[PDB]
Write a protein that binds this DNA or RNA. Structure first.
Ligand SMILES: [Mg+2]
Ligand SMILES: [Mg+2]
Ligand SMILES: [Mg+2]
Ligand SMILES: [Mg+2]
Ligand SMILES: [Mg+2]
Ligand SMILES: [Mg+2]
Ligand SMILES: [Mg+2]
Ligand SMILES: [Mg+2]
Ligand SMILES: [Mg+2]
Ligand SMILES: [Mg+2]
Ligand SMILES: [Mg+2]
Ligand SMILES: [Mg+2]
Ligand SMILES: [Mg+2]
Ligand SMILES: [Mg+2]
Ligand SMILES: [Mg+2]
Ligand SMILES: [Mg+2]
Ligand SMILES: [Mg+2]
Ligand SMILES: [Mg+2]
Ligand SMILES: [Mg+2]
Ligand SMILES: [Mg+2]
Ligand SMILES: [Mg+2]
Ligand SMILES: [Mg+2]
Ligand SMILES: [Mg+2]
Ligand SMILES: [Mg+2]
Ligand SMILES: [Mg+2]
Ligand SMILES: [Mg+2]
Ligand SMILES: [Mg+2]
Ligand SMILES: [Mg+2]
Ligand SMILES: [Mg+2]
Ligand SMILES: [Zn+2]
Lengths: 47, 71, 111
RNA sequence: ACCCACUCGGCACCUUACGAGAAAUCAAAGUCUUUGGGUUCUGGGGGGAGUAUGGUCGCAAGGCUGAAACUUAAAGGAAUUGACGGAAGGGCACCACCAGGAGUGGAGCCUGCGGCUUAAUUUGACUCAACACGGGGAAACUCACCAGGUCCAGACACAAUAAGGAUUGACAGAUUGAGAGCUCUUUCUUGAUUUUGUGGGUGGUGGUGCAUGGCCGUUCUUAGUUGGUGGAGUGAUUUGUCUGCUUAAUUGCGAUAACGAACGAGACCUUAACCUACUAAAUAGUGGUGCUAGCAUUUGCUGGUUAUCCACUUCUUAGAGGGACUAUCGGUUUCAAGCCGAUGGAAGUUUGAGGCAAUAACAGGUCUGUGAUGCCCUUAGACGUUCUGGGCCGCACGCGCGCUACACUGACGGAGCCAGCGAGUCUAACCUUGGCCGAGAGGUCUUGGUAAUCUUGUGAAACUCCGUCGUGCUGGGGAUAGAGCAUUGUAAUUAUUGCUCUUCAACGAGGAAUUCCUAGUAAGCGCAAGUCAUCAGCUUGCGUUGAUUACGUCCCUGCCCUUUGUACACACC
């Protein structure tokens, strides 16, 4: 009986589903947008 | 199985010791700095790396191994 | 175990199959292993119709005691086949004759 | 004396059952909840126990009378279905025999298993259903074993340590099998990635197949399984599902309280056979014509020419069809299902051979196929993993599958010379024609092919032909062993394989035993594919040559079926 009732509710879920009822800036290119300089320093090689 | 034969004598890994170091940068007096332990000429080593001193040896540690420089 | 399987067998049937079979093997709650058949309606087990009609699957459900096998068998209604033979080779059907009103001394018509 | 009918009283059987019973059954065990003819005797869950005690009878053995405490959830009856038997009756089969064929068992080697040996000789499996099986042909790898050396690839959480440095790496030397910074000397480097501890994970060809999934092997070269309406029984159940006959088959016929059905068998599907009918093909092939070579010449005969053109589809290829249904006729039989012979036919043994294959059982096998998995074990001096080397091949011997032979239906040497199933190279070195060099194995320069196109007509082998040898361990046989040359590979020593010369063992048909097999089959014979860098004496398929003898039975062996017995049902373990 509870098996049947199970199958009956499976028919309810099944028949009710027969009808029923952005964050931009693109991080790929955001490093190219933030690509502006003054991000480092390099000087070396004495003696 | 068999469980534990061995001829004793186990093996330790390593330390890296202590060495608070870099106490070798020499000032003469107030405030001049004469820079003990001469520095490496390899472009990957920006002279912020130095050469160790052993017998016949001046060795660059920044190169994991490479480039014996001898003096 | 019985409720779960029995339901499945009944929903398959309510979906308009010819027949269905469910088997569970492995151990449930008892040390020793058993196995159960759950079947309803019509199925053929042999020959080419097998490749045509019945649909089989086995899934291993992994539980804390051990793992159970789940075998399922669905026999589709060959009448709805829509690509293939529409019946088992077994099926032999005789079209039904029709009552005659004989005699009627001959004459003839004209057009 | 005998026959027939009747009648009293007998010992019994038969058929019914109104009736009775838990049923088996019963003219009483019937005339009982619609409970009363008379009367005697015994029982009140199982053990304890017909025991203890007293009485009494007895020569004795013992008889009669005869308790309790305590213990215990069953014991017991009839019947049903199973399962089993060292009971009876029927069957079926070259994993049985008969008639035989080829053998194995004897020999040398090959290979697996045991045993022994070993630092290790990793391991699973032991009647058919372990032992050329784990696709298990192991040089490294594989790899699980043994002698040794590295590494963490120890997620994540908390804590500790600590930017004055938590931690990482290394040149040379020592060291080491090692050009491993493994460790040590020495001293640069690295920057919060790690280290240390606990908790918790993770990997493992570690254990458990007697904890499991899945898969497979076996019973089964078998024929069994169920429900609808009706008949029987209070019921579990049973009849249907059966004496016989027939069949490869619970395949059918027939008998019939059954009638008609489903799963499994059959059908079905694949492969091999038949199409001068259909549709076609320069990646298949034929005739014709050009172009062309040789020999005869009288037209002829035999070739060349991946397109010089025209046509075709017999052969080849694969699509769609067709065809067989044991047909026709006749014997035999309950004149039923069928079976047998003849004719015809591509085909008439389920047309031949397969695939698929119900219900149910086994402590069959596999945790060493799986990143399938419970639990246990282990987890940094690891049972993780990698690196070097060894081992799985070790040899008084026992067992199994095989290879090659003992020759003259033969070895050898020339010569003839014919298959079929296959496979083959991209971010690569696979299948290989051809030309040269080389006795050989092979080398070298090129080439076609991602393929009906090239290797390849796979010119394979037995076999056919002409010679040499002459019955002598012979030129049969090729084990063992020496010396040399090549190939695969980082590496060939315990010799991967190939080639040459030499060395020339056992074996003269194999005791007791035992395997397989009925037609293009047995047996002989090689080939492709799997494995594969190299290595088949293995397997999976293939085609070539092609017999003898059954066409039967239950004697042996194996298994099914009834009948029967059961105190078994975890079912004779
Ligand atoms: Mg069927
Ligand atoms: Mg079939
Ligand atoms: Mg009766
Ligand atoms: Mg015989
Ligand atoms: Mg013999
Ligand atoms: Mg190794
Ligand atoms: Mg390492
Ligand atoms: Mg830890
Ligand atoms: Mg722990
Ligand atoms: Mg594992
Ligand atoms: Mg098992
Ligand atoms: Mg299993
Ligand atoms: Mg075991
Ligand atoms: Mg047979
Ligand atoms: Mg029966
Ligand atoms: Mg044709
Ligand atoms: Mg004929
Ligand atoms: Mg076992
Ligand atoms: Mg497994
Ligand atoms: Mg071995
Ligand atoms: Mg064998
Ligand atoms: Mg010879
Ligand atoms: Mg010859
Ligand atoms: Mg030469
Ligand atoms: Mg000789
Ligand atoms: Mg002989
Ligand atoms: Mg090969
Ligand atoms: Mg093998
Ligand atoms: Mg009985
Ligand atoms: Zn440097």
């Amino acid at each position: 009986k509870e098996a049947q009732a199970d199958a009956a509710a499976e028919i309810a879920e099944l028949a009710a589903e027969a009808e029923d009822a952005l964050q931009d800036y693109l991080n790929q290119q955001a490093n190219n947008q933030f690509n502006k300089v003054p991000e480092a320093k390099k000087v070396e090689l004495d003696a | 199985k068999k469980v534990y034969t061995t001829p004793k004598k186990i093996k330790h890994k390593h330390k890296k010791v202590k060495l608070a170091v870099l106490s070798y940068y020499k000032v003469d007096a107030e405030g001049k700095v004469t820079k003990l332990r001469r520095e490496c000429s390899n472009p990957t080593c920006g002279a912020g790396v130095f050469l160790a001193n052993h017998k016949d040896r001046l060795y660059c540690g920044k190169c994991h191994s490479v480039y014996k420089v001898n003096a | 175990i019985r409720r779960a399987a029995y339901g499945v067998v009944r929903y398959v049937m309510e979906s308009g199959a010819k027949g269905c079979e469910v088997v569970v093997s492995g151990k449930l709650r008892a040390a020793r292993a058993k196995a159960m058949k759950f079947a309803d309606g019509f199925l053929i087990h042999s020959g080419q119709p097998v490749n045509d009609f019945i649909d089989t699957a086995t899934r291993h459900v992994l539980m804390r005691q051990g793992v159970l096998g789940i075998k399922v068998k669905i026999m589709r209604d060959p009448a709805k086949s829509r690509t293939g033979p529409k019946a088992l080779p077994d099926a032999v059907t005789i079209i039904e004759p029709k009552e005659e009103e004989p005699i009627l001394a001959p004459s003839v018509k004209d057009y």
